[PDB]
Paper text:
In the autoinhibited state of MINDY1, sulfur-centered hydrogen bonding of the catalytic C137 with the hydroxyl of Y114 rotates C137 away from the active site. In the active conformation, this inhibitory Y114-C137 interaction is broken due to the Cys loop movement, and the side chain of Y114 now hydrogen bonds with S163. Interestingly, in the MINDY1∼Ub complex, which represents the product-bound intermediate state, Y114 is hydrogen bonded to S163 before the transition back from the activated to the inhibited state after Ub chain hydrolysis. These observations strongly imply a linchpin role for Y114 in regulating the transition from an inhibited to active state. Disruption of this single hydrogen bond with a Y114F mutation results in increased DUB activity, with an ∼30-fold increase in kcat compared to WT. (H) A close-up image of active site of apo MINDY1 Y114F mutant compared to WT. Hydrogen bonding of C137 to Y114 is broken in the mutant. In MINDY1 and MINDY2, an additional layer of regulation is imparted by a sulfur-centered hydrogen bond between a Tyr and the catalytic Cys, which further reinforces autoinhibition.
Numbering used by the authors: 109 to 180, 184 to 370
The structure:
């Protein structure tokens, strides 16, 4: 109930009573997105008694998990740096992380130190925010620029003497006005296609981090919402429609219905 305390839903996962962390805040900290993936993979175990958990608790669990990862062609020297780099930006996942997306593919983002937690834990970060290839106008306008970059450029555009840069200026502005809930249809398709069937990942949209997976060839996000705390029958929520209706499922990915 209080601000760095979170509630522990217990749910029958791959045979066993498994914990999962619920947030009503729906913030921009990835800790739960990552942590939930870990509890699901059973890399972290909570005593069954357990009801609430602190940030500081999760944070410990995560640090020991990272320092516990056995090395394995991969990065050689780049591994050991990767660990130290993870360790040095580890205390920032608490306070939550700004992500600068690229519109160019579901896996592309401007690299930041926080990306090392994900990269090391074998967790992919994906996003849905892709510029469609049906509008060659806008693909070229936005181009290979980053988001925080696009806004910089849009502004230096409104002020250019070349009118063509105010054309691109207004095109790029347009795409952001239109695609502002940050999942294009194109995004969804590409991202559906792209995730490994079965594998747990982290889905970014509207400064929010979610735990994702692919199943029977569609996407589902784990239900961190706290309202559905009592309801174990409620775990996954479909991500089939870009904007529309969700069908809640039990851990076995079959339909469930709330009290």
């Amino acid at each position: 109930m209080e601000p760095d305390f979170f509630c522990v839903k217990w749910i029958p996962w791959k045979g066993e009573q498994t914990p999962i962390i619920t947030q009503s805040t729906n913030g921009p900290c990835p800790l739960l997105a990552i942590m939930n993936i870990l509890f699901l993979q059973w890399k972290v175990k909570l005593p069954p008694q357990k009801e609430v958990i602190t940030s500081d608790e999760l944070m410990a669990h995560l640090g020991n998990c990272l320092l516990s990862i056995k090395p394995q062609e991969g990065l050689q020297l780049n591994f050991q740096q990767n660990v130290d780099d993870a360790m040095t930006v580890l205390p920032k996942l608490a306070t939550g992380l700004d992500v600068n997306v690229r519109f160019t593919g579901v896996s592309d983002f401007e690299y930041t130190p926080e990306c090392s937690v994900f990269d090391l834990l074998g967790i992919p970060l994906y996003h849905g925010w892709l510029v469609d290839p049906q509008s060659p106008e806008a693909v070229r306008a936005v181009g290979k620029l980053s988001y925080n970059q696009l806004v910089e450029r849009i502004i230096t555009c409104k002020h250019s003497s070349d009118t063509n840069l105010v054309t691109e200026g207004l095109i790029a502005e347009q795409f952001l006005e239109t695609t502002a809930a940050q999942l294009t249809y194109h995004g969804l398709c590409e991202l559906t296609a792209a995730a490994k069937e079965g594998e747990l990942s982290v889905f970014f949209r509207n400064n929010h981090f979610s735990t994702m997976t692919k199943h029977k060839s569609h996407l589902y996000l784990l239900v961190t919402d706290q309202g559905f705390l009592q309801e174990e029958q409620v775990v996954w929520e479909s991500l089939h429609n870009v904007d529309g209706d969700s069908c809640f499922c039990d851990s076995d990915f079959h339909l469930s219905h709330s009290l």
